Design a protein around this ligand. Structure first.
Ligand SMILES: [Fe+3]
Ligand SMILES: [Fe+3]
Ligand SMILES: [Fe+3]
Ligand SMILES: [Fe+3]
Ligand SMILES: [Fe+3]
Ligand SMILES: [Fe+3]
Ligand SMILES: [Fe+3]
Ligand SMILES: [Fe+3]
Ligand SMILES: [Fe+3]
Ligand SMILES: [Fe+3]
Ligand SMILES: [Fe+3]
Ligand SMILES: [Fe+3]
Ligand SMILES: [Fe+3]
Lengths: 172, 172, 172, 172, 172, 172
């Protein structure tokens, strides 16, 4: 039997498939960072990062749903192993914020390509993703700001972890 | 600062970490199978397999939570690129059933090792997973039985896909 | 058309089928004991034993459901007629308690084999059955204890039957 | 102590005890037919026949209750293994319908003997059973009619089994 | 009058009686640790440890109930006086965590013995206890981790005690 | 850091600590008596005495709370191994009543010392304990009266145990 051709252009198909991969890779990076925190007495940051990991996977799933509805094959390649060696809480959040900046850039790139190719169905679909990613990037900026304001001396790590724990619980 | 040692034995840690990566590999395989179905007009099977993929990731997350609570570092590997090419609906479900049989075996192995090492916290924890996996294995057996009962003559594929669609919708 | 192979091992299949037949035999035995009580003015014990007989059939049905879901043929065998002649209330409950001890042993044997063969789906499934049988064995121990505490002399049978009637009604 | 004599005549006692045993044997037959269906990918018919088996045991219990209340000893006979080998769905339901006709005839015989002996307590008691058996006989006639209308070629078995599944679920 | 024999094996009887003693001894150890905290301005830890003491006694009672139901004599020996001299909060929680590890080991031992003797009624009964003890062991690991993360300098003790106070209140 | 001195006098501290250990000794004695009853078919008395044992521990806990709030270190001793062997139901309740009389005397002694030393916080605190102990002493007097009124001829033990069972159930 004949099935209809993919409804998206080759370039958009490529970018969206790559984005699914990026989000799956992100989820595993955040699981790794979360585990580091849990095994170093930082269960507040552990919980926050675990829940964020799960959210990145939810983004991957929403992208997959869009590809499916457009008859676009989801061609999954490998998901690269995440970074696992970390120096401390500050470094983890520095790396996390940098990572979120990279993800924001990748989304801007897809949206820009959608505009150039006049693919406004894709442009329109991506708006929840733009908005949610901005909130996530701002959140990591804010947490990093707070970690650096507190520092790691004189119960600093404890205070920072409890701060992050509060955020984790409030977002549930 | 000093954090407490992992609360599980080396062998149990190895098996559980391997299981996390098994579930992640499985999840992406099911996403690939799901996409094949969606792009070949089989949206019932597409939906069923997508929802199953999501559930396998939920299993991975529950295993991660247990590792975290036991102060065990999670070792996230590179996730395999899944098979992209399939012959048809029957082949997909034959492959899936065989795969679920192998997952069941892997869980039986961990539970067995837990008994041998007298790790009854782990034995007790795994019981939800034993029960859920059994239900999943039976489900795939039932779907395969039905696909083979219907066959792919005349409107056979349509009938089978609609059957699977009904199951997918009933489970959510 | 092709149907999938039984999902359980040959030894486990044999033990489970034997158990179904054991429960059916138990139902008949208890119906016979119940009738003896009813025809000898012991309607309290009659009711208790009738309801217990029905519960043993419920166990048989639950085991059958498990065999069915695993694509295991149910093998219902020839069973002897139950004993119909009894000496009195004490003898009936002595025989019943001994019978429940035998049933408990038979279940312990299946669970043990499940562990040995690493069949943890069956191990997990049987846990309701282990728990319910334990409750039943304790119950028969308690009733036999009370029958022996009361005795057979002046109004003893009446007091014992009313005690058992109370239990029967409270379990409804 | 003295217990009152059976309240029913010897002939009625014989017929009622025979009927209890008939219902027990019927339950076993239907469990066997159900198992055949489940192991041959016909879970709709499997469920229907399992539920019907359970209903036949319920009939046996109601007859037993009546015997108990009349101080009539219940005489349970030996069980012979039910037939376990069958040719297919149509043959199973052909055999089942013939079986239900036999059961209907047996009940008609008891009611006739109740009239002849002026045992109107028993006549009155049996009315629920006459009514329920009639409904069951009509049901099996209807299912057999549908199986024969559908046929066994070109998805026929699937369609028939799904039809029977619908009935099974609607009666729950 | 004759009472039925104990329903458990001699080895299981011994282990369970010893376990009742262990839990009673634990309750008194935790009362002693609690008192130390209360008399050293650490009422958060005082409350937490008092409530935990009460919970260990609840475990002893549940074990006693199981022994009673199985007609097993509860043969209580002395409860050893608890340790009472402590260096500080960290040492108390170090000792407490070590103690919980010992208790977990003792439970694993009983469950292992139940498997070896095929006493699956006891195995099944102990599952709530395995699960609850694991949660308790994890809890003490977590609190010790937090105490060591905070330390005892620069309001450290106050911060740690307030942290533990929060946990105590949340578990009520 | 400096913690405040105990808020009670040396003599009151001694008496209260002795009372805590008296209640713990009592609790285990009642557990022993309860077990004797359960293993000799007297589950009514078994239940009553178990629940009473649990209540005596509750009294110990309330005394501990008062010591804690007054910054008084609790001195937990080794708890005596209770008597295991008893002659019968009557002897158990004679021993229990005599024991409750001695507990009442011990409480009267503490209250008297509180008056003599002008410790009215302690006098006031003990009032719930005076009241509850009086109710308990009266209860044991009443049960002993009833056991002696019934006697242990024919079904006497059964009647007495059922009487006590009614009291046990009514109090919870
Ligand atoms: Fe993000
Ligand atoms: Fe994102
Ligand atoms: Fe699975
Ligand atoms: Fe799985
Ligand atoms: Fe058709
Ligand atoms: Fe039983
Ligand atoms: Fe049973
Ligand atoms: Fe019928
Ligand atoms: Fe019938
Ligand atoms: Fe514990
Ligand atoms: Fe414990
Ligand atoms: Fe008292
Ligand atoms: Fe008292």
């Amino acid at each position: 039997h004949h099935s209809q051709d993919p409804m998206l252009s080759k370039d958009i198909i490529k970018l969206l498939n790559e984005q699914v991969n990026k989000e799956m890779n992100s989820s595993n990076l955040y699981m790794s960072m979360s585990s580091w925190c849990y095994t170093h007495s930082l269960d507040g940051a552990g919980l926050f990062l675990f829940d964020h990991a799960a959210e990145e996977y939810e983004h991957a799933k929403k992208l997959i749903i869009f590809l499916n509805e457009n008859n676009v094959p989801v061609q999954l390649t490998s998901i690269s192993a995440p970074e696992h060696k970390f120096e401390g809480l500050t470094q983890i959040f520095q790396k996390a914020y940098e990572h979120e900046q990279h993800i924001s850039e990748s989304i801007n790139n897809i949206v820009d390509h959608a505009i150039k190719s006049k693919d406004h169905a894709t442009f329109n679909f991506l708006q929840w993703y733009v908005a949610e990613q901005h909130e996530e990037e701002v959140l990591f900026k804010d947490i990093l700001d707070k970690i650096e304001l507190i520092g790691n001396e004189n119960h600093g790590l404890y205070l920072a972890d409890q701060y992050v724990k509060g955020i984790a619980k409030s977002r549930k």
